[PDB]
Amino acid sequence: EAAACKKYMSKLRTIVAAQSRFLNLCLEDIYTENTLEVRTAALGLEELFSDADTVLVVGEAGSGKSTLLQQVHLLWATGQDFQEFLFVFPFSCRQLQCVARPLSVMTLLFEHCCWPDVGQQDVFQFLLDHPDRILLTFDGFDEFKFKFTDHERHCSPTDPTSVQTLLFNLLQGNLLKNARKVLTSRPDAVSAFLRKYVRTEFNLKGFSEEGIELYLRKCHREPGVADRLIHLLQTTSALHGLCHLPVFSWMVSKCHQELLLQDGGSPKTTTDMYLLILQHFLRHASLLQGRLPTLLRLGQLALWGLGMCCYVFSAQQLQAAQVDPDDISLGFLVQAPLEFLHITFQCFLAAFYLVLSTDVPTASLRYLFNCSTVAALLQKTEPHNLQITAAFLAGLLSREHRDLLAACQASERSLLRRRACARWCLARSLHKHFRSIPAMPGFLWLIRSLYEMQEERLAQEAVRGLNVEHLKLTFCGVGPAECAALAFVLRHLRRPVALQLDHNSVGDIGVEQLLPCLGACKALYLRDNNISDRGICKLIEHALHCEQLQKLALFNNKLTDGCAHSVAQLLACKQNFLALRLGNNHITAEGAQVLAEGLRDNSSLQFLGFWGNKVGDKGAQALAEALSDHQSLKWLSLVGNNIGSVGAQALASMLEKNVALEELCLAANHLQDAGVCSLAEGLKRNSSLKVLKLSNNCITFVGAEALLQALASNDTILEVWLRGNPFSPEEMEALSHRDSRLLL
Ligand SMILES: Nc1ncnc2c1ncn2[C@@H]1O[C@H](COP(=O)(O)OP(=O)(O)O)[C@@H](O)[C@H]1O
């Protein structure tokens, strides 16, 4: 025999592993790296854990959050990772919302997760006694409803209470203090009330471009099929775009065979994708009117549930919405209480119902864009689900799908009327948005909706009269397909806009999908967006034809010497260009030498940044020589670029000639007193440079003096930064007294 603890441990592992294992398929063969990032390197799943003991994982519908927990569970239940926890308790929030009956923690862990065969009482005790060896996971937290009578304290494990009260208290640390928790949610339902008690907060972006490649390889084993899909994607920017989000990579893979036939051109918008998967399911049975009433019966349930904030259905609810076995087999319902294959499929079918059902009055649709029980359901529906439904609604009414839908109607009269109502709401939508700004996730969904409807004139109308100068979309979850929408709408602006896209997941594919609106930008900010030389070399060939575009910022991407020649062409040819930021990439001396040629033949540039790169002495020469004669550049960072005294000589020689450079940043090289001395020689023939940052540079009092001697005859400099250098406390005292401008 063994005790009741070791017995439960082993039951739990069995049951968890048994559920975690499968998605005929095997999660362990199929799971594919899905990047995990923080604040608010970049860490893998295995690094998930490293006061307040609850970790949060947040990402858009379909970014792989459910599947991430599922792998955590599998990895634990089989020994491979996360072995510090003796017990792991998987929960699904959409299933807990369905429990009215108040609950104790016991009845939770045991009735609603895993029943111990023996020792119930003794086991629970062990858990209470050793909480630091417990993990609880809660999937899809957004699918709870937290109310005004669920905030009370409650520390009793044995005392019944409501379901949500348990969670609230679990997370604070009132129940199972020091036990770990992991939550997955959409970005909306994370308020700062919760956020107080979160260890760390991760963000789940989706597959990188080589993720997708991997994924496809893992799923398709047939000889070189993965290759031929990776070909399809590499010839089809839009489809490739969508696949950065695994639910699309899944769909693509799921329809490989019909995608590879085509014959009739690939899909482009998200609605196209959801239509393609629909017809796939319908081939296991026009084709669509064949199963029309089925889809309507499902859509009705979808909208119902959506309006009700119920994403799981009891066979009583299923009979009450008249869904027979023949309906269920079509395969949108799954997993016996049933749920929709994915939340997005609920939203698609709801949108479908909304288009075609003859119980949906035109005016009800006005609620999808914020402008019948149908109407009432829409008002009660969660915003992040309405945003999605409405995007699909837009798509289904596109001109491309006139015909599909004209099959199912006896009378297009109805469709004409809904199209026109949607179109009306959409045209108003962007004014409605900016005029009530007392936001910017709401903005993209409006963009996505205009893009899906696919009418060009409609984008134009929606944008007419707006006065946008700056458009901040940082940390907004912008991928390759958000980029496609953004382009679709923004290209129509007549005011050059500053497109601030810092900290997203644009990548090379997003850059390509942005290009049509590049003409409408005066400034493109794409820091921390995982862009390679392929992306930037493309971006430049197009930038050369946009005279409006003057600033480009590409800090912290994967650029390398391979982009050098393109950069040389940019500086040499665009001649109203103002600002270029390339900090934190992998440019080296050779790239620097190469691109500098373009600098020599440049007239207009004003800022040029290289912080974090490694141009070194030969790269610092080549830039210095280029900038000696250069008439407009006023700022230059070579911070952290491994520049010895050889490059500092060259930069000095530059200052004897250059008459325009005002600031020159050098912190974090290895300059030594040698370099500072020639730099100081330079200052004695420069009546123009204002600031000279020289922090963290192995400079000794010897150097400081050469600078001070030069500062004797030079009055134009305002500051010379030296902090962090090897100065003795007694040496520092002296330097304060000796000249005011030396910032220590
Ligand atoms: N890391 C992954 N590896 C392989 N497939 C994934 C991964 N993440 C998501 N998927 C695919 O996407 C589908 C839906 O993803 P899901 O985990 O439900 O995202 P979310 O729960 O955030 O909406 C999965 O059933 C699976 O096909």
Residue numbers in the entry: 195 to 217, 225 to 241, 254 to 263, 271 to 505, 518 to 567, 577 to 612, 637 to 703, 715 to 1020
What text appears in the publication on this structure?
NOD2, also known as NLRC2 or CARD15, belongs to the NLRC subfamily of NLRs. NOD2 possesses two tandem CARDs that function as an effector domain and is activated by muramyl dipeptide (MDP), a bacterial cell wall fragment. On activation by MDP, NOD2 is believed to undergo self-oligomerization via the central NOD domain, providing a scaffold for recruiting RIPK2 (receptor-interacting serine–threonine kinase 2) through CARD–CARD interactions. Here, we determined the crystal structure of the inactive ADP-bound form of NOD2, and revealed that ADP-bound NOD2 is maintained in an auto-inhibited/closed form through ADP-mediated and inner domain interactions of the NOD domain.
Moreover, we introduced surface entropy reduction (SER) mutations (E943A, E944A, K635A, E636A, E709A and K711A) into the OcNOD2ΔCARD construct to produce the OcNOD2ΔCARDSER construct. These CARD-defective NOD2 proteins for structural study would be inactive, because the CARD domain is required for triggering NF-κB activation through the serine–threonine kinase RIPK2. The OcNOD2Δloop construct exhibited activity comparable to the wild-type OcNOD2 in response to MDP, while the OcNOD2SER construct exhibited no activity in NF-κB reporter assays in HEK293T cells. Gel filtration chromatography analyses revealed that full-length OcNOD2, OcNOD2ΔCARD, OcNOD2ΔCARDΔloop and OcNOD2ΔCARDSER exist as monomers in solution. In addition, we determined the structure of OcNOD2ΔCARDSER, which is isomorphous to the form 1 of OcNOD2ΔCARDΔloop crystal, at 3.1 Å resolution. The structures of the NOD2 molecules in these crystals were essentially the same, with root mean squared deviations (r.m.s.d.) between 0.4 and 1.1 Å. Of note, several mutated residues for SER mapped to HD2. Mutation of these residues may alter the charge distribution, resulting in reduction of the activity of OcNOD2ΔCARDSER.
